[PDB]
């Protein structure tokens, strides 16, 4: 929907009790190439943290902006590991925070604490306002009430029984009610309108599931209990993967036929509206410079699911090297094309269906199409001169006036076209090579002293050519041609008189040097 | 010289001075009276002269003097007769003259005049005069006057009980005699008194200030005589006495039994007039069934058609209990039947009409048909009531044959609606009865009857055609009669189409003469296109012998296919019109349609 | 009484009269309290004589009216009125008569009911010679001096009916129609006609209210004006054609006929009035001694009036006289026999009604 | 794309009682009205694709999408007279044909011509509307079109009063299923030809009025016509619900090389045809225009022309079968519709920059802009979901250990990454194991016996052994292992 949806705020929490420290009975075979060591199994906490981190990596890869996420380990203390500002919602900082957290203590105090502190901290943290929420509130003045603060809390823990599940369900409902009541009176704390909750449970494989799966249940109009349950290891990673696909209406793609295996990409679902659970597209022969400006109806970022695997590494490296990739959907029709715009692989969506703007009227029969003397090359030069460039340094114009560079571009555009004849035969001053430096330099905002010297030299040899009676371009006697080009030049310089006092100076010099009858 | 000559001379001398000197004439008359106090002529002269002066006290004095002293003079009797006629500016002057006379002398003169009168009617007239002016004369002459009036009326051999004598007897004599607490009367003469009174009102109110209230007061009067408010609470009260009355009785029980018979009769008739005055005031109303669901009873009356609907319903319901009580008790049943036969005659019309609505309300129908025959015999708008109530009782529960016969006859004579009633006048209310389609009370106009008549025929044909098979003119008649009041016929018509889809042999031969509805025409041609049962539709006069009498040729199939679509386009062109007019036109034309209803 | 006279000699005439009137009031009240019948002494008479201009006379009359209205006891009122106005056979009677006439005229003017009833009581016990003079003065004052003043005498009907009856009796006794100047005034004819016709009992209230214990003294006024009214009705036409205005004559004739009829009716009800009082056939309000002079003067007028020229007038007068006699003798008011009636009517002219009355 | 779904059921052959003149069937009324619409759409909207599907019991498409209106104008007068009305089938067919021809993004107005009689049952509008809304299933109601459609129902059934007797709530509920975008059109009056003409004129003014605009590049101006008319866009429904349309005066702001723009995410490709304001070729053909010059220059040079339509909403005016034209695009409104171009408010002339960023030889290129924070596939992240990843990493670290002491720096960097991930994930057993296999490879050292190589591997093994205790000796994240000298 809008920017502030139920997926805007994701508040991860993680179990940190000593109960979540035993291995998951899924020992790996990281020994490939004597007598190898005993196979090693990741701990429950490690598996949960790893799967959460994969979720967040996909989060950040597809949605760099306008989607934040917290991290609240649930230990004897309640620690929030990163804040809501975009400068702190980063992957490496989260890595650092988890590293500083340290492995769970095996025999410190098992029954001293549970994950209720994590849930109460999450509902406490969720009620705050993001930078985007604050900006929207400030922008919409005196009516900043239609901005929902809906979020979502996710929990990974090893629950003892379903009675415990109902217990912390009642606890979270009570604490969200209390938080809403507290935030009603306060000002710098929003009231949660919808806090969807997920209470995933993990267990080592080979052990019975003490908690059965429970469907969606709304204990309150501000809470949606969706407690799941799955084993640790690969199952938990797959569960968080389908979670991240479901939460943000993502989609999958299965690019195959790669010259050298298949590769999978995750992106926004809107890329698949043309086809209308993984679509399978084929790499097609990439032509170097067949066409340059495609008709892309959507640019959706992608994120590999196996970013450290050989096929995905090869594909992403080739894309980042600069060349695009033209996929095709399953006689053939051209379809989605990959691209790499600075290091953010996009999945553009072309339009293979018939264009409703087919067989456009000929430009040779429209108004003005029967003229073959257009200054197309000169306008090409004009386009090249007035090209755009990004400005990362905002300067001040006069006094506290932070000029918008777009307005500067518009003003330069207006200045360059104060006298721009459309057809070659219309003008004579522009067609002559003598006044070309003067034409190029006079349109600038402020001519320098070297510019003054150049314009003086230009008028000098213009008068020299007048004296020599050289054949000017036809564009009706020689004197008539001279007087008309002088009139054109004086008209051009007159319109730029207000640009600077140097323009007035050169106009006065021209008037003094003019051979007026 | 005889004194008569002197008296005549004195009177003549007094008479001559009247135009010149009234006082001198009076002095001469006074002197003549002093000389001859026993002379009647002089006293009459003073009386006439003073009457020419319009005086009251002296006129009364002289009149009393001559009446007492000279009662044999015809002039005095003529003067008294003139005075009595005035009692029945000069009228007021003579009224004042009678007032000055003493009350006893006035009573004596009135009695003398009554004795001298020969005509019985006039004699009773000043008998009632003296009766009202002197209430002390009620005891001696009140009973005699009424008895003589009754005997004279009987002697006159009045074929009709309504006559002037009975009118005076009821209106004047009875209040005077029964308002007195001296005359003692038996417990039987009261029965004849109210019986005569009961005949007075019903003859007058069916065909004067307020007879109904006056006679109900008489019922109160005959109430205390036998012992010696709204009209609703009474029946419950007498009903409670019945719970004490029809129980143990020993010798007569004359008091309670007679009261619960006669009094119940009066309230029943009072309610009877109330009910038949609101409905059928002379637009009149008629009582029917509903049948409305073609797709302990209570009467459904529209408030718009009758502003006073609530009170009329209660009077009818309260009358029903009165008639039920008057027939429930075996002892009361026999006497009431005897009482009615005495003075019910041919039930007149108001009771006869009221009787019929009782039958249809109770549940019995055969007596309603028999009663309906009587109404027709006793008897324009009028024929609607007999026919429309005959139709619903014929419908009953399981006839379905005579009902369609009667309504078709009513259809033939009911054709006013050149414009019907507009387009839509307050489309039927969404009030849903608690699983009740019950007795309605509609006006005698086409606005309410027209949907009802087609409601009846649709109900009869719906049961006739939806069972068994072969979809004969039965089903075709349902389709035509389902045209009315769209879209309430949606489901039932779709059921008919489904049956038509099953058999595929529909044949009406008049489909394109009655069904001017686009929602039905459009649906029907859907069959002929995709897979429908090639409905026959011999919708062209003289087509059977065209197929039969002509040798099989291949140049006819194109025409057989084309005409159905062409005539369907023709029927489309009609559309519009007035739905009731087209439906009625089918009704009158297809009077042989009743052959199917015999099923 | 010497001390009272001495004390009052130092006061003015009006003041002296006022205090001597008060002294007579208290003295007569004490006398009546002591004895039922008080004897009138010469002391009060002389005190009134020597104690009781136009302004002074008017002030004295107003003081007398105020004194009479203030006191409420009737016996003292009547006794003091009599002592003030009863003739004593002296030269001061004329002044007393003038003062009484002025007082009665003022009382009629201002409706002084006690003064009116005092005058009626005194006039009842007064010789007719003074009564006729008082009536003459009242008639002048209310009929001839100030026109329209008879309406003031109109209102006396509802105030003192006994005074009305006495005034009628006095004017009938005075205006005996024996001369042209003695003919009753036309306004007075209307006046008495309205008085009698408004209330027929007016001329009989005196007879009813007076306890009859002895015969009236000779020379005094009659109990009822019936004799005077009968005489007026009888000889009134005779004087009218003796004086020979047609409209006034017709109005007077109608008035006299109506008055005669009302007198006959009054006699008719007086028959009853004598009936309940047990005076029927014993007491006669119309004395026999009064019909002889009226018959004689009727005969004199008839002889003087040339009956060949006034046959109708004589016939009408004789008819009226015969009717009056018949009603009087039939009602018991005239205790007489038919032989006596025949004897007195022998000299009267022939008249069929008169002969019938004589025969009976 | 306009699909003219004209009802052809028997219900439109009902004659109307028009006063004065002869009786017309409602089919002829629709024919005249659609004739007016097609004449206007051919004379002033000639670039428009239209199709005329007729429906009754079953829907059939007589003429597919075409710009030749002399085909459709004759297709109106050669129609049949089928019976039965089934709107749901027509809507399904329209969805199918639009999806088959154009796709799922091009707008497609649907000018439906109903009669207000609806139907009687089964396939009727009433039955489907009352049931399929709560039923859906495979036969879901097609009224919620799967593309930016527009359902204009022209119920030519007298005034609102005539259709208020039987059924108009069904129709205005039918429009509602299209997200409320549409308009019920009713002919107010006694079915006179003037009234239906005004009705179709109202439709024309609402929908088929070309979007005129002025194309300004500084001072140079041109009068253009942008076809199709741009669809107003909405940022969201929470912070800015008011739709934003492009401004009438499209102002060119700058020109960007076609290589630097790559293939931007556009909203809708729009042609820009100059409009004058054999006469056209003999007068407007010779008058110098600006759009022709712009298109020619853009095609020859191979560049685009960034345009500023509305505040915080930009586009581009590029150039181009063999036919070519100046088709302009539209970006998503916002500060930076193109992430690899920077905030578009921060693009200025090359004069204001210190040097020429494009270069004197036109070799360097300021674009594309590198993102502030690098992604994961460009960086070196350490994923371990599948055991294959950890196996590959451990095989790489073991193989590079054999190459000692040649690639000491690479082996040290890889070991540093491995330990960084190890103490990040707290999977200490992995660190113990890699110490053990470093010892094992030390036992299997080759016969070359490089002195420095043995010292480096022994030092690395000792570092891993001490770090496997978990104490704060080298447990610091930044405590990268340094090879011995």
Swiss-Prot record, chain A:
Entry comment describing in which tissues the protein is expressed = Widely expressed. Tends to be up-regulated in seminomas compared to normal testis.
Q: Which GO terms describe its cellular component?
A: cytoplasm; INTAC complex; integrator complex; intracellular membrane-bounded organelle; nuclear body; nucleoplasm; nucleus
Cellular localisation: Nucleus; Cytoplasm
Keywords assigned by UniProt, alphabetized: Cell cycle, Cell division, Coiled coil, Cytoplasm, Isopeptide bond, Mitosis, Nucleus, Phosphoprotein, Ubl conjugation
Reading the lineage from the top rank, the first entry is Eukaryota
A GO molecular function assigned to this protein is:
DNA-binding transcription factor binding
Its main subcellular localisation, reduced to a broad class, is nucleus
Q: Where is the signal peptide?
A: none
Which BP terms from GO are recorded? cell division; centrosome localization; flagellated sperm motility; mitotic spindle organization; protein localization to nuclear envelope; regulation of fertilization; regulation of mitotic cell cycle; regulation of transcription elongation by RNA polymerase II
Entry note about domains: The cleavage module binding motif (CMBM) mediates recruitment of transcription factors.
What biological function has been recorded for the protein in this entry? Component of the integrator complex, a multiprotein complex that terminates RNA polymerase II (Pol II) transcription in the promoter-proximal region of genes.
Question: Belongs to which family?
Answer: Belongs to the Integrator subunit 13 family.
Name used for this protein in its record: Integrator complex subunit 13
State the encoding gene.
Answer: INTS13
UniProtKB/Swiss-Prot annotation, chain B:
Q: What does this protein do?
A: Component of the integrator complex, a multiprotein complex that terminates RNA polymerase II (Pol II) transcription in the promoter-proximal region of genes.
Q: Which GO terms describe its biological process?
A: regulation of transcription elongation by RNA polymerase II; RNA polymerase II transcription initiation surveillance; snRNA processing
User: Which first-to-last residue range defines the signal peptide?
Assistant: none
Q: Which family does it belong to?
A: Belongs to the Integrator subunit 10 family.
Q: Where in the cell is it found?
A: Nucleus
Assembly description: Component of the Integrator complex, composed of core subunits INTS1, INTS2, INTS3, INTS4, INTS5, INTS6, INTS7, INTS8, INTS9/RC74, INTS10, INTS11/CPSF3L, INTS12, INTS13, INTS14 and INTS15. The core complex associates with protein phosphatase 2A subunits PPP2CA and PPP2R1A, to form the Integrator-PP2A (INTAC) complex. INTS10 is part of the tail subcomplex, composed of INTS10, INTS13, INTS14 and INTS15.
Which residues lie in coiled coils?
A: none
Enumerate the UniProt keywords alphabetically: Isopeptide bond, Nucleus, Phosphoprotein, Ubl conjugation
GO CC annotations on file: INTAC complex; integrator complex; nucleoplasm; nucleus
Q: What name is this protein filed under?
A: Integrator complex subunit 10
Q: Which Pfam families match?
A: INT10
Swiss-Prot record, chain C:
Where's it mainly located? nucleus
Q: Tell me a GO biological process for this protein.
A: eye development
Source organism, top-level taxon: Eukaryota
Q: Which GO terms describe its cellular component?
A: chromosome; INTAC complex; integrator complex; nucleus
Q: List the disulfide bonds.
A: none
* Localization per record: Nucleus; Chromosome
Q: Which residues form a coiled coil?
A: none
Q: Which UniProt keywords apply?
A: Chromosome, Nucleus
Q: Which InterPro entries match?
A: INTS15
The record ties this protein, via Pfam families, to: INTS15 (PF14964)
Family per similarity comment: Belongs to the Integrator subunit 15 family.
Q: How does it assemble?
A: Component of the Integrator complex, composed of core subunits INTS1, INTS2, INTS3, INTS4, INTS5, INTS6, INTS7, INTS8, INTS9/RC74, INTS10, INTS11/CPSF3L, INTS12, INTS13, INTS14 and INTS15. The core complex associates with protein phosphatase 2A subunits PPP2CA and PPP2R1A, to form the Integrator-PP2A (INTAC) complex. INTS15 is part of the tail subcomplex, composed of INTS10, INTS13, INTS14 and INTS15.
Function description:
Component of the integrator complex, a multiprotein complex that terminates RNA polymerase II (Pol II) transcription in the promoter-proximal region of genes.
- Official protein name in the record: Integrator complex subunit 15
The opening ranks of the lineage are: Eukaryota, Metazoa, Chordata, Craniata, Vertebrata
Swiss-Prot record, chain D:
- Gene Ontology biological-process entries: regulation of transcription elongation by RNA polymerase II; RNA polymerase II transcription initiation surveillance; snRNA 3'-end processing; snRNA processing
Q: In which tissues is it expressed?
A: Strongly expressed in numerous cancer cells compared with their non-cancerous counterparts (lung, prostate, colon, stomach and skin).
Quaternary assembly = Component of the Integrator complex, composed of core subunits INTS1, INTS2, INTS3, INTS4, INTS5, INTS6, INTS7, INTS8, INTS9/RC74, INTS10, INTS11/CPSF3L, INTS12, INTS13, INTS14 and INTS15. The core complex associates with protein phosphatase 2A subunits PPP2CA and PPP2R1A, to form the Integrator-PP2A (INTAC) complex. INTS14 is part of the tail subcomplex, composed of INTS10, INTS13, INTS14 and INTS15.
Span of the signal peptide? none
Gene3D superfamilies, alphabetized = von Willebrand factor, type A domain
What gene does this protein come from? INTS14
- What name does UniProt use for this protein? Integrator complex subunit 14
Annotated InterPro entries: INTS14, IntS14_b-barrel, IntS14_C, VWF_A, vWFA_dom_sf
């Amino acid at each position: 929907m809008k920017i502030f949806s139920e997926s805007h705020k994701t508040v991860f929490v993680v179990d940190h009790c000593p109960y979540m420290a035993e291995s998951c009975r899924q020992h790996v075979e990281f020994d490939m190439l004597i007598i190898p060591l005993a196979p090693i199994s990741k701990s429950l906490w490690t598996c949960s943290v790893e799967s959460s981190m994969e979720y967040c990596r996909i989060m950040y890869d597809i949605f760099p902006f306008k989607k934040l996420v917290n991290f609240i380990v649930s230990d004897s203390g309640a620690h929030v590991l990163n804040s809501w500002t975009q400068e702190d919602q980063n992957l490496q900082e989260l890595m650092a925070a988890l590293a500083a957290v340290g492995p769970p203590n095996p025999r410190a105090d098992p029954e001293c604490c549970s994950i209720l502190h994590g849930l109460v901290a999450a509902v406490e943290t969720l009620c705050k306002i993001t930078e985007y929420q604050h900006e929207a509130r400030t922008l919409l003045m005196e009516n900043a009430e239609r901005v929902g603060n809906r979020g979502r809390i996710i929990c990974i823990t090893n629950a003892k029984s379903d009675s415990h599940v109902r217990m912390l369900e009642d606890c979270v409902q009570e604490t969200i009610h209390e938080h809403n009541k507290l935030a009603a009176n306060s000002d710098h704390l929003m009231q949660i309108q919808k806090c969807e909750l997920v209470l995933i449970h993990t267990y080592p494989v080979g052990e019975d599931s003490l908690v059965s799966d429970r469907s969606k249940k709304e204990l309150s109009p501000v809470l949606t209990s969706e407690v799941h349950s799955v084993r640790a290891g690969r199952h938990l990673a797959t569960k968080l993967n389908i979670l991240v696909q479901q939460h943000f209406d993502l989609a999958s793609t299965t690019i195959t036929n790669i010259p050298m295996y298949d590769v999978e990409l995750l992106h926004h679902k809107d890329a698949h509206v043309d086809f209308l659970e993984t679509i399978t597209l084929k790499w097609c022969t990439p032509r170097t410079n067949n066409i340059e400006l495609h008709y892309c109806t959507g640019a959706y970022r992608i994120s590999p699911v196996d970013v450290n695997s050989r096929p995905s590494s090869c594909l992403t490296n080739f894309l980042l090297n600069g060349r695009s990739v033209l996929l095709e959907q399953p006689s053939k029709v051209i379809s989605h094309m990959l691209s790499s715009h600075g290091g953010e692989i996009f999945l553009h969506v072309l339009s293979s269906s018939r264009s409703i703007l087919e067989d456009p009227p000929s430009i040779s029969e429209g108004c003005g199409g029967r003229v073959t003397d257009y200054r197309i090359t000169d306008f090409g030069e004009f386009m090249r001169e007035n090209r755009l460039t990004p400005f990362l340094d905002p300067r001040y114009k006069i006094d506290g006036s932070l000029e918008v560079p777009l307005e500067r571009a518009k003003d330069q555009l207006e200045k360059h076209t104060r006298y721009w004849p459309m057809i070659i035969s219309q003008t004579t001053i522009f067609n002559m090579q003598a006044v070309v430096p003067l034409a190029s330099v006079i349109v600038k905002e402020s001519l320098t002293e070297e510019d003054v010297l150049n314009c003086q030299k230009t008028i000098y040899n213009l008068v020299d050519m007048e004296r020599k009676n050289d054949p000017l371009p036809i564009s009706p006697k020689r004197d008539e041609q001279y007087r008309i080009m002088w009139n054109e030049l004086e008209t051009l310089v007159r319109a730029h008189i207000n640009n600077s006092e140097k323009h007035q100076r050169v106009l006065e010099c021209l008037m003094a040097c003019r051979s007026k009858p | 010289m005889s004194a008569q000559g002197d008296c005549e001379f004195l009177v003549q001398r007094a008479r001559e001075l009247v135009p010149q000197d009234l006082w001198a004439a009076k002095a001469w008359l006074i002197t003549a009276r002093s000389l001859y106090p026993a002379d009647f002529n002089i006293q009459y002269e003073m009386y006439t002269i003073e009457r020419n002066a319009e005086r009251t006290a002296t006129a009364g004095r002289l009149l009393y003097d001559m009446f007492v002293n000279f009662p044999d003079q015809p002039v005095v009797w003529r003067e008294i007769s003139i005075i009595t006629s005035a009692l029945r500016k000069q009228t007021q002057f003579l009224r004042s003259l009678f007032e000055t006379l003493p009350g006893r002398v006035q009573c004596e003169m009135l009695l003398k005049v009554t004795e001298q009168c020969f005509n019985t009617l006039e004699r009773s007239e000043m008998l009632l005069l003296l009766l009202r002016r002197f209430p002390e004369t009620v005891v001696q002459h009140g009973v005699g006057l009424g008895e003589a009036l009754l005997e004279a009326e009987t002697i006159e051999e009045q074929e009709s009980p309504v006559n002037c004598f009975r009118k005076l007897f009821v209106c004047d004599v009875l209040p005077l005699i029964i308002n007195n607490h001296d005359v003692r009367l038996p417990a039987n003469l009261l029965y004849k008194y109210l019986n005569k009174a009961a005949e007075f009102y019903i003859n007058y109110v069916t065909r004067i200030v307020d007879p109904w209230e006056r006679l109900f007061k008489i019922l109160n009067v005959v109430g205390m005589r036998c012992e010696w408010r709204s009209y609703g609470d009474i029946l419950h009260r007498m009903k409670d006495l019945c719970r004490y009355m029809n129980n143990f009785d020993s010798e007569a029980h004359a008091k309670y039994k007679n009261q619960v018979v006669y009094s119940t009769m009066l309230v029943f008739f009072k309610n009877a007039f109330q009910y038949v005055n609101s409905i059928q005031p002379s637009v009149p109303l008629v009582l029917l069934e509903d049948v409305s669901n073609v797709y302990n009873r209570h009467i459904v009356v529209n408030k718009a058609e009758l502003a006073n609907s609530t009170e009329v319903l209660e009077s009818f319901k309260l009358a029903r209990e009165s008639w039920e009580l008057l027939y429930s008790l075996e002892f009361l049943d026999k006497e009431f039947t005897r009482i009615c036969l005495a003075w019910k005659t041919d039930t007149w019309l108001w009771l006869r009409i009221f009787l019929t609505d009782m039958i249809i309300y109770q549940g019995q129908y055969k007596k309603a048909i028999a009663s309906l025959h009587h109404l027709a015999a006793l008897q324009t708008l009028e024929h609607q009531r007999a026919l429309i109530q005959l139709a619903t009782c014929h419908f009953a529960l399981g006839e379905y044959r005579m009902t369609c016969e009667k309504v078709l006859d009513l259809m033939c004579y009911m054709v006013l609606p050149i414009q019907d009633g507009g387009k839509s006048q307050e489309e039927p209310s969404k009030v849903k009865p608690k699983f009740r389609s019950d007795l309605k009370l509609l006006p005698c106009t086409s606005k309410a009857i027209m949907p009802y008549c087609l409601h009846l025929m649709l109900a009869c044909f719906k049961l006739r055609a939806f069972t068994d098979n072969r979809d004969d003119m039965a089903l075709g008649h349902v389709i035509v009669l389902l045209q009315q009041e769209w879209p309430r016929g949606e489901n039932l018509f779709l059921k008919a189409v489904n049956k038509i889809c099953q058999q595929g042999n529909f044949q009406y031969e008049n489909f394109f003469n009655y069904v001017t509805n686009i929602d039905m025409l459009e649906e029907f041609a859907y069959l002929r296109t995709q897979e429908g049962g090639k409905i026959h539709l011999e919708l062209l006069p003289n087509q059977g012998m065209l197929i039969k009498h002509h040798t099989v040729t291949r140049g006819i199939t194109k025409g057989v296919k084309e005409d159905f679509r062409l005539a369907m386009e023709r029927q489309v062109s009609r559309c519009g019109e007035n739905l009731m007019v087209v439906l009625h036109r089918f009704c009158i034309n297809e009077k042989i349609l009743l052959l199917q209803t015999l099923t | 009484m010497s001390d009272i006279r001495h004390s009052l000699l130092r006061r003015d005439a009006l003041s002296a009269a006022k205090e001597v009137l008060y002294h007579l009031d208290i003295y007569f009240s004490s006398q009546l309290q002591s004895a039922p019948l008080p004897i009138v002494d010469k002391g009060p008479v002389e005190l009134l004589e020597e104690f009781v201009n136009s302004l002074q006379e008017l002030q004295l009359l107003e003081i007398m009216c105020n004194y009479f209205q203030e006191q409420t006891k009737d016996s003292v009122r009547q006794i003091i009125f009599s002592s003030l106005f009863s003739p004593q056979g002296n030269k001061a009677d004329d002044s007393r008569m003038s003062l009484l006439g002025k007082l009665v005229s003022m009382a009629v003017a201002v409706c002084r009911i006690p003064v009116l009833e005092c005058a009626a009581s005194w006039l009842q016990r007064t010789p007719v010679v003074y009564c006729v003079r008082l009536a003459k003065a009242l008639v002048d004052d209310y009929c001839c001096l100030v026109p329209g003043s008879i309406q003031t005498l109109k209102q006396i009907f509802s105030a003192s009916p006994r005074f009305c009856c006495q005034f009628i009796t006095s004017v009938t006794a005075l205006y005996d129609l024996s001369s042209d100047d003695l003919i009753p005034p036309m306004d007075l004819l209307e006046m008495i006609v309205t008085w009698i016709f408004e209330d027929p009992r007016l001329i009989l209230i005196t007879f009813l209210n007076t306890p009859i214990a002895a015969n009236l003294p000779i020379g005094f006024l009659e109990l009822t004006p019936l004799v005077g009214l009968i005489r007026w009705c009888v000889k009134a036409p005779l004087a009218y054609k003796r004086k020979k205005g047609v409209g006034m004559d017709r109005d007077s004739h109608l008035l006299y006929s109506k008055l005669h009829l009302s007198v006959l009716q009054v006699l008719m009800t007086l028959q009853l009035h004598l009936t309940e009082k047990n005076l029927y056939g014993r007491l006669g309000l119309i004395l026999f001694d009064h019909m002889v002079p009226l018959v004689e003067e009727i005969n004199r007028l008839a002889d003087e009036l040339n009956p060949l020229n006034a046959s109708q007038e004589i016939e009408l007068s004789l008819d009226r006289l015969a009717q009056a006699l018949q009603v009087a003798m039939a009602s018991g008011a005239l205790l007489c026999t038919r032989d006596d009636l025949r004897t007195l009517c022998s000299r009267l002219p022939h008249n069929n009604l008169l002969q019938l009355v004589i025969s009976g | 794309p306009t699909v003219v779904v004209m009802d052809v059921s028997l219900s439109m052959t009902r004659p109307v009682s028009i006063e004065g003149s002869e009786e017309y069937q409602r089919k002829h009324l629709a024919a005249h009205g659609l004739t007016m619409l097609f004449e206007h759409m051919a004379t002033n909207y000639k670039l428009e694709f239209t199709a005329l599907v007729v429906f009754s019991s079953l829907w059939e498409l007589m003429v597919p999408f075409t710009r030749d209106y002399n085909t459709l104008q004759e297709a109106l007068s050669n129609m049949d007279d089928y019976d039965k009305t089934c709107l749901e089938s027509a809507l399904v067919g329209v969805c199918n044909i639009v999806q088959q021809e154009w796709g799922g993004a091009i707008p497609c107005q649907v000018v439906l011509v109903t009669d207000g009689c609806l139907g009687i049952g089964r396939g009727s509008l009433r039955h489907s509307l009352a049931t399929q809304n709560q039923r859906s299933e495979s036969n879901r109601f097609p009224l919620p079109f799967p593309f930016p459609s527009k359902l204009y129902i022209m119920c030519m059934a007298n005034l609102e009063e005539l259709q208020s007797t039987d059924s108009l709530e069904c129709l205005e509920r039918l429009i509602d299923l299209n997200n409320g975008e549409g308009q019920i059109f009713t002919i107010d009056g006694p079915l006179c030809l003037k009234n239906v003409q005004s009705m179709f004129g109202k439709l024309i003014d609402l929908a088929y009025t070309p979007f005129h605009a002025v194309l300004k590049c500084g001072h140079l101006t041109a009068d253009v016509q942008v076809f199709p008319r741009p669809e107003p866009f909405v940022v969201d429904e929470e912070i800015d619900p008011i739709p934003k349309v492009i401004n009438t005066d499209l102002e060119i702001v700058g020109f960007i090389d076609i290589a630097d723009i790559s293939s931007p995410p556009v909203l809708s490709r729009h042609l820009v045809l100059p409009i004058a304001l054999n006469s056209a070729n003999q007068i407007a053909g010779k008058i110098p225009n600006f759009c022709v010059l712009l298109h020619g220059s853009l095609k020859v040079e191979g560049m685009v022309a960034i345009v500023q339509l509305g505040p915080e909403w930009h586009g581009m005016l590029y150039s181009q079968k063999k036919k070519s034209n100046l088709m302009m695009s539209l970006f998503e409104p916002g500060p930076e519709p193109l992430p690899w171009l920077g905030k578009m408010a921060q693009l200025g002339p090359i004069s204001d920059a210190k040097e020429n960023p494009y270069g004197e030889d036109d070799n360097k290129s300021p674009f594309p802009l590198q993102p502030k924070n690098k992604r994961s596939y460009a960086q070196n992240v350490t994923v371990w979901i599948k055991p294959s990843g950890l196996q590959t990493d451990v095989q790489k670290i073991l193989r590079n250990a054999r190459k000692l002491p040649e690639k000491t720096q690479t082996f040290y960097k890889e070991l540093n990454r491995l330990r960084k991930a190890a103490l990040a994930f707290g999977f200490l057993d992995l660190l113990k194991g890699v110490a053990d296999m470093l010892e094992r490879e030390c036992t299997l050292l080759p016969e070359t016996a490089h002195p420095d190589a043995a010292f480096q591997l022994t030092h690395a093994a000792q570092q891993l052994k001490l770090a496997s205790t978990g104490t704060s000796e080298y447990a610091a994240y930044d405590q990268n292992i340094t090879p011995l000298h």
